[PDB]
């Protein structure tokens, strides 16, 4: 019955959706591992994906009402519906899978922050799944609570987040001596020399890497599919989409070149270590700024910039607010996947075909909800909370993410390639080619690693394929 | 005007091209990588996917005669012809690509032999490309001229293969002690204990033996394509395929079983080698025979079912009649695939719309011929022929040939999937199920071996697809 325009929506969904827990948690591990001049290339090649995508999706809004259907018609044109639902079950699925992770990291960051409080659970390895469990319940309970309730949470959510980035950006141009064994250093050109190059630590490499990240770069298209109950779409979409890609990618260059410049990988964080810094040989650029964060590669040393996941969190000022921002945004990024993901589920299975779990009318909450769709997704995203750590799970996102990309750009191509005599597009910049390139450029990505996975991955879709197209 | 069914087309030209150089050249080779318990699994395997994609070209041909075109629409009657044309152009490049294969086979196993003679080439490596180019410019002649001729030359072809093979089977029954330290010994079980367990000499795996052989059971969509000169298809085509698949694969059975029983993968070829076989430990059961073909694990020894590439040829009687089968092999294959090519590119191609080589009336060669489609698979034929030692070229025989037999049965399967109202088939044993479990194994075979040279090749078929669906 209310309806908004242009900016709150798209802009503050497709923004906070993309700024889930890697740009506090993991962004420091991964300029850790890929130097700045790797880790911004990483940036710009997951901004490219996703921005290609987000012109793919462009199109498919910029299209009229077509009257076969604005569920699957609108995908796919030229070929059948068939592929629509097959990426409809494969992205709203990713889309849990992705509220999953994201709490996940809420649950591992307040865990985290809990230790290092007075007192902590049991295991470190277990509570994590237990509060898990406890705040994806609350979310499951507050998103089936009111309409304007959330937007108004998400618009103050993404005011502190801002507010946090804001604080840490501050806290970068203060060097503070209480913190001289910690990385931070306060804008070295020793600092950026060593950074500049990639080092990649244990096993990882430059594709494992932007594996990890990619999470990152993805989930705009979640506020694509708010186009249901959005006012005026084929124009607010990819004005919002795109604007959203901007920030954010221009964001994430800015933070990572800054915390590549204010720490090192190495500090043996202690406050007997000397900070004496005598005139010794010391190749590793990091006694040039003092005898702190010196000569740790022998064992495992404490922190700063490759243990320390909460890197840029300590180097800020006021780190309750740095830990508030963390939250928001992980809070945020969940509550925005897990809204995306049944209400896909509903819009391209709306005659409810294979399951019925509750009566299409009431639900579960406070209010009854006719959505009988958010339990499925719960279930799922709750049996990858049943594992922890979040580093398994990422692989999951990004094999799943760039599937459902290429697919949504194999078939915009497809549509704009064959007759289709239906497709019609209106955007400016659209191109079939662009789109050919980015649906080409996921597969290699996706192929590369773990070529396995994309593999039984690409047979999982093409099962659901059959699966869609025979029960249908 | 002249029309033969049921036995003589379908059977002879299937069993004959079946019946490359693999057989009776690489054979050897692969039993000493591959142990007998592997190598029967792999010419099992091998065996699995040429007749599933048997029975799904045979569902092909039972099909009525579709107005829409014999060319492409019985291919892909549920989707467009775009498929059927992309699997003609991705099949017959791969036809093209055998022939060349084939021919430098040829060129090698002669230039082999003219070695063992008296004198030889500037350099083995060099004369086998010429020879190979002066016996393809050869099948240029002969293929071009006349129709009965080649019919009655493939039966004759047939019958020395087939004594050859009888003799070769002929000459295990019989130990000869003239040759004791060569890998022959005759029926021993310790010759048996020990080649039944696989043993990799310097790099190659499972997998990778069962790339280098598939070549060998491919190519019977060859006769496939003789439907259209063929006088009564949609029973000969099928009936044919499966007698010669099933025939060649027991031939296959039984000659990988007779030569893992006969030899050993370590023998020291010499006169002065000392055969007493005294009573020593020997842990490796070459010694059990006798001292011959005892201990030359530490340098590379003369040869024996590991170096010997004409093993087989070797422990036959009557050595010319071993080698004029391998050249009645080869040729027979050879000139099949290169009928085989260039007639499928005008028969899925009849527009000519890339090129026009010829005028479509005259031709090269001692009459003029209407193909002007000759022209082409020679040059990439030659083009590949410019390369010796034909080792890297299996694997592009193996990824094609697998792209082509996935794509036939993705295909035939969507077809009887989809509504396909056109589709109808009328084969009693064809399934679906079982033909889209022979395109997943296909493209799971493909991306096991060399997973980028399989994503590359999808690539290429996939660039193939939009330039058929777009200058149509």
Redesign the interface.
């Known amino acids: 019955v209310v309806k908004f325009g242009w900016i709150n929506g798209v802009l503050v969904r497709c923004m906070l959706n993309i700024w889930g827990v890697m740009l506090f948690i993991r962004l420091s591990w991964i300029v850790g591992q890929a130097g700045i001049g790797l880790s911004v290339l990483v940036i710009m090649m997951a901004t490219v994906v996703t921005t290609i995508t987000g012109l793919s999706t462009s199109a498919i809004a910029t299209n009229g009402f077509v009257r076969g259907g604005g569920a699957y018609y609108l995908i796919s044109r030229s070929?059948?519906p068939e592929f629509g639902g097959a990426i409809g079950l494969i992205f709203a699925f990713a889309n849990a899978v992705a509220v999953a992770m994201y709490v996940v990291g809420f649950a591992e960051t307040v865990v985290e922050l809990l230790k290092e409080h007075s007192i902590l659970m049991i295991d470190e390895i277990n509570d994590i799944r237990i509060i898990g469990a406890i705040t994806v319940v609350i979310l499951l309970g507050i998103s089936v609570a009111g309409m304007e309730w959330e937007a108004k949470a998400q618009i103050v959510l993404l005011v502190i987040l801002l507010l946090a980035i804001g604080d840490f950006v501050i806290g970068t141009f203060i060097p503070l001596e209480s913190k001289k064994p910690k990385g931070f250093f306060g804008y070295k050109s020793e600092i950026f020399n060593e950074n500049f190059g990639p080092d990649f630590r244990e096993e990882e490499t430059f594709f494992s890497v932007f594996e990890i990240f990619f999470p990152a770069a993805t989930g705009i298209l979640a506020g694509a599919n708010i186009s249901g109950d959005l006012a005026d779409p084929q124009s607010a979409l990819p004005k919002g989409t795109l604007l959203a890609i901007l920030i954010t990618t221009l964001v994430y260059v800015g933070i990572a070149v800054s915390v590549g410049s204010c720490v090192v990988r190495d500090a043996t964080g202690n406050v007997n270590d000397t900070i004496v810094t005598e005139l010794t040989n010391c190749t590793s650029a990091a006694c040039k700024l003092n005898f702190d964060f010196s000569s740790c590669e022998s064992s495992p040393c404490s922190y700063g910039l490759m243990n320390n996941f909460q890197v840029m969190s300590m180097v800020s000022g006021f780190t309750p607010l740095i830990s508030a921002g963390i939250f928001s945004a992980t809070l945020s990024s969940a509550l925005a996947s897990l809204v995306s993901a049944p209400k896909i589920f509903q819009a391209l299975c709306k005659d409810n075909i294979y399951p019925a779990f509750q009566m299409f009318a009431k639900g579960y909450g406070k209010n009854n909800e006719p959505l009988r769709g958010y339990i499925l997704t719960f279930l799922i995203a709750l049996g990858f909370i049943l594992i922890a750590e979040c580093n398994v799970i990422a692989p999951i996102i990004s094999n799943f993410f760039l599937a459902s990309y290429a697919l949504i750009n194999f078939s915009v191509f497809h549509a704009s390639?064959?007759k289709s005599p239906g497709w019609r597009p209106a955007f400016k910049y659209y191109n079939m080619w662009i789109s050919?390139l980015g649906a080409?450029l996921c597969?290699?990505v996706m192929?590369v690693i773990n070529?396995?996975a994309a593999?039984l991955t690409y047979?999982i879709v093409l099962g659901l394929y059959?699966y869609v197209?025979?029960k249908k």
Chains 1, 2 share one sequence.
Request: glycine share 6%; charged share 0%; proline share 0%.
């Open positions: 070929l059948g390639l064959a050919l080409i597969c290699i192929f070529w396995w593999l047979v059959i197209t025979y």
